[PDB]
Design an enzyme around this catalytic site. Structure first.
Site, PDB file in Angstrom:
ATOM      1  CD  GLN A  19      -1.535  -0.499   3.524  1.00  0.00           C
ATOM      2  OE1 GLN A  19      -1.894  -1.399   4.283  1.00  0.00           O
ATOM      3  NE2 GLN A  19      -1.909   0.761   3.688  1.00  0.00           N
ATOM      4  CB  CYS A  25      -4.886  -1.443   4.662  1.00  0.00           C
ATOM      5  SG  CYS A  25      -5.920  -0.708   5.879  1.00  0.00           S
ATOM      6  CG  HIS A 162      -3.764  -3.616   8.772  1.00  0.00           C
ATOM      7  ND1 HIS A 162      -3.484  -2.487   8.032  1.00  0.00           N
ATOM      8  CD2 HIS A 162      -3.149  -4.641   8.131  1.00  0.00           C
ATOM      9  CE1 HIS A 162      -2.746  -2.815   6.987  1.00  0.00           C
ATOM     10  NE2 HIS A 162      -2.531  -4.116   7.023  1.00  0.00           N
ATOM     11  CG  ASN A 182      -0.451  -6.915   5.888  1.00  0.00           C
ATOM     12  OD1 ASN A 182      -1.168  -6.027   5.431  1.00  0.00           O
ATOM     13  ND2 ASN A 182       0.213  -6.759   7.006  1.00  0.00           N
TER      14      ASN A 182
HETATM   15  C1  LIG Z   1      -5.274   0.718   6.844  1.00  0.00           C
HETATM   16  O1  LIG Z   1      -4.241   1.452   6.262  1.00  0.00           O
HETATM   17  C2  LIG Z   1      -6.628   1.576   6.792  1.00  0.00           C
HETATM   18  N1  LIG Z   1      -7.481   0.756   7.667  1.00  0.00           N
HETATM   19  C3  LIG Z   1      -8.789   0.931   7.819  1.00  0.00           C
HETATM   20  O2  LIG Z   1      -9.447   1.831   7.208  1.00  0.00           O
HETATM   21  C4  LIG Z   1      -9.439  -0.066   8.765  1.00  0.00           C
HETATM   22  C5  LIG Z   1     -10.091  -1.197   7.932  1.00  0.00           C
HETATM   23  C6  LIG Z   1     -11.588  -1.504   7.764  1.00  0.00           C
HETATM   24  C7  LIG Z   1     -11.994  -2.681   8.576  1.00  0.00           C
HETATM   25  C8  LIG Z   1     -12.532  -0.326   7.878  1.00  0.00           C
HETATM   26  N2  LIG Z   1     -10.407   0.557   9.658  1.00  0.00           N
HETATM   27  C9  LIG Z   1     -10.767  -0.123  10.740  1.00  0.00           C
HETATM   28  O3  LIG Z   1     -10.281  -1.230  10.985  1.00  0.00           O
HETATM   29  C10 LIG Z   1     -11.754   0.144  11.863  1.00  0.00           C
HETATM   30  C11 LIG Z   1     -12.751  -0.822  11.917  1.00  0.00           C
HETATM   31  C12 LIG Z   1     -13.752  -0.813  12.872  1.00  0.00           C
HETATM   32  N3  LIG Z   1     -13.716   0.213  13.785  1.00  0.00           N
HETATM   33  C13 LIG Z   1     -12.755   1.187  13.769  1.00  0.00           C
HETATM   34  C14 LIG Z   1     -11.763   1.148  12.790  1.00  0.00           C
HETATM   35  C15 LIG Z   1      -4.578   0.856   8.224  1.00  0.00           C
HETATM   36  N4  LIG Z   1      -4.070  -0.203   9.133  1.00  0.00           N
HETATM   37  S1  LIG Z   1      -2.493  -0.212   9.806  1.00  0.00           S
HETATM   38  O4  LIG Z   1      -2.124  -1.607  10.187  1.00  0.00           O
HETATM   39  O5  LIG Z   1      -2.552   0.731  10.953  1.00  0.00           O
HETATM   40  C16 LIG Z   1      -1.353   0.439   8.632  1.00  0.00           C
HETATM   41  C17 LIG Z   1      -1.434   0.049   7.268  1.00  0.00           C
HETATM   42  C18 LIG Z   1      -0.473   0.604   6.289  1.00  0.00           C
HETATM   43  C19 LIG Z   1       0.523   1.511   6.619  1.00  0.00           C
HETATM   44  O6  LIG Z   1       1.295   1.929   5.570  1.00  0.00           O
HETATM   45  C20 LIG Z   1       2.509   1.122   5.161  1.00  0.00           C
HETATM   46  C21 LIG Z   1       2.491   0.413   3.957  1.00  0.00           C
HETATM   47  C22 LIG Z   1       3.528  -0.354   3.582  1.00  0.00           C
HETATM   48  C23 LIG Z   1       4.622  -0.463   4.370  1.00  0.00           C
HETATM   49  C24 LIG Z   1       4.691   0.206   5.543  1.00  0.00           C
HETATM   50  C25 LIG Z   1       3.648   1.003   5.951  1.00  0.00           C
HETATM   51  C26 LIG Z   1       0.633   1.912   7.985  1.00  0.00           C
HETATM   52  C27 LIG Z   1      -0.344   1.352   8.992  1.00  0.00           C
END
Ligand SMILES: *[C@@](O)(CNC(=O)[C@H](CC(C)C)NC(=O)c1ccncc1)CNS(=O)(=O)c1ccc(Oc2ccccc2)cc1
Length: 215
Positions: A19, A25, A162, A182
């Site tokens: 991503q 994600c 996530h 992932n």
């Molecule tokens: C995702 O980036 C965005 N996640 C969401 O929007 C989630 C998913 C769905 C289920 C809506 N929101 C919620 O889970 C949620 C659900 C229910 N109630 C409240 C909230 C973020 N996830 S992360 O693990 O924090 C993440 C992902 C990517 C990232 O960027 C990188 C990419 C590649 C390499 C390194 C970093 C950082 C953190």
């Protein structure tokens, strides 16, 4: 063999992606469900467009976040979604520029699994194909994973943050597990994948936000 299924062998899974610096994600997780079906109901798997959902699904936040069910509603109400090649992934918000000419797939709705029912999830995975899930990926033990069946007691089923894609299930060394894909590139975990604990009281809240689209 016991009760277990791995869809990567089958052909319902597309190669791992990254991503980057965009919280897309969710767009990656919905696109994966969409592909699982497109294989199952066509015979040919093809890469679908995460960028397309990132720009046009106004019901969501762009790189700021979004739910997966909201992603399905759009594919339907829009009547088609682009292929990667057609709508490239630039990992950044921009104008929605849907090219109907390259419409590669479509769905006619979706269906959520019962909030917290792991068994209902397992059946969905076995009878439907890849399901879209949302877990707690905040713990460092999650992030530095390389092998084994992950399990962390301090994981929070109330901190869904996530979104990923359940690709199958099975056992390991007396350990049940959910084969998870992932989107942090194929350099994270075991080639992009992680094995999460299955049947350990719904760890990290695996079954609290699942759904799959219908095709
Ligand atoms: C995702 O980036 C965005 N996640 C969401 O929007 C989630 C998913 C769905 C289920 C809506 N929101 C919620 O889970 C949620 C659900 C229910 N109630 C409240 C909230 C973020 N996830 S992360 O693990 O924090 C993440 C992902 C990517 C990232 O960027 C990188 C990419 C590649 C390499 C390194 C970093 C950082 C953190």
């Amino acid at each position: 063999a016991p009760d277990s299924v791995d869809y990567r062998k089958k052909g319902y899974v597309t190669p791992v992606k990254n991503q980057g610096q965009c919280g897309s994600c969710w767009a990656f997780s919905s696109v994966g469900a969409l592909e699982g079906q497109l294989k199952k109901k066509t015979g040919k798997l093809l890469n679908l467009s995460p960028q397309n959902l990132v720009d046009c699904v106004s019901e969501n936040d762009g790189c700021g976040g979004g739910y997966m069910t909201n992603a399905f509603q759009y594919v339907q109400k829009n009547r088609g979604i682009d292929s990667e090649d057609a709508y490239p992934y630039v990992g950044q918000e921009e104008s929605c520029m849907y090219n109907p000419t390259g419409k590669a797939a479509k769905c006619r709705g979706y269906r959520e699994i019962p909030e917290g029912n792991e068994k209902a999830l397992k059946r969905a995975v076995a009878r439907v194909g890849p399901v879209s899930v949302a877990i707690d990926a905040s713990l460092t033990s999650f992030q530095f994973y390389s092998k084994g069946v992950y399990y962390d007691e301090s994981c929070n089923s109330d901190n869904l943050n996530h979104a990923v894609l359940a690709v199958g299930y099975g056992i390991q060394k007396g350990n049940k597990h959910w084969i998870i894909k992932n989107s942090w590139g194929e350099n994270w975990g075991n080639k992009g994948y992680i094995l999460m604990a299955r049947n350990k009281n719904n760890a990290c809240g695996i079954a609290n936000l699942a759904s799959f689209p219908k095709m």
